[PDB]
Structures are given as structure tokens and as C-alpha cells.
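Project outcomes to date are best conveyed with an example. Our students and postdoctoral researchers have been running inverse folding experiments weekly, and each run begins with a structure described purely in C-alpha cells. The record below, which covers 114 residues, was selected by the lab manager from last quarter's runs and is presented without edits.
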């Protein structure tokens, strides 16, 4: 089947930034340039995870995120706006969109010595 259809969306780019501690899980960097591929369907947070969990995320996911969704501690923010109000997984990233990922769970702190 040649010359079937034509119209493959183009690759979108998004600026991902992680607070303190999480950045380490990603080449230890404050800002990370992401470039998602192009397809018939727009890159939605749901999928985005799979990428940021593999492509970006260099360390074990179970540590940063668990599953297609962000851990119960990792708070994300799309364009300075809780992804909750927009769309935890319903949102569909288009382009020039900046995604923030902060970690407020891994805070090993208890019995002090010094």
C-alpha cells in the first residue's frame, strides 16, 4: 500500500524542570530540553510520563514515579498551574509548553546526631 495517507504531526518540544533532589534522577540538571515525536494524537501527560520515565529519567522510576502516573508525592505544574485543574492525564501537551516536576516525599530526616 503506497501513497495511502499523508499528515504525520511534527515533533513538539517542551522544557522540563525539576526542583531540588529530583534533578539528580535526570542527569542532575535544573532544566531539560524535551523533544517529543509527531503522531496522529497529541502528546498527553499520560504518555509524556512513559518518555520522561525512560528517555529523561536515567535512574529507577519506582524512585521518581510509579506507573503511567506521577507518584503521590511528585507534584507537577504545567505552565505554572497545577495539572490537576488543567488535566492530570486528560491534558494534551502541544508545544513550547514547560512542565515542572517537584518531589515532596523523599525527605529522609529524623534522628539527628550533629
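After processing, the design step wrote out the following sequence:
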Amino acid at each position: 500500500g503506497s501513497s495511502g495517507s499523508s499528515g504525520m504531526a511534527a515533533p513538539l518540544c517542551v522544557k522540563v524542570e525539576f526542583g531540588g533532589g529530583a534533578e539528580l534522577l535526570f542527569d542532575g540538571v535544573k532544566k531539560h530540553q524535551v523533544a517529543l515525536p509527531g503522531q496522529e494524537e497529541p502528546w498527553d501527560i499520560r504518555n509524556l510520563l512513559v518518555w520522561i520515565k525512560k528517555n529523561l529519567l536515567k535512574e529507577r522510576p519506582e524512585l521518581f514515579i510509579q506507573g503511567d502516573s506521577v507518584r503521590p508525592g511528585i507534584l507537577v505544574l504545567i505552565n505554572d498551574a497545577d495539572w490537576e485543574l488543567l488535566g492530570e492525564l486528560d491534558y494534551q501537551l502541544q508545544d513550547q509548553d514547560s512542565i515542572l516536576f517537584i518531589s515532596t516525599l523523599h525527605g529522609g530526616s529524623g534522628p539527628s546526631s550533629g
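The chain has one domain: 10-105. The radius of gyration is 16 Å. The training component of this project remains on track.
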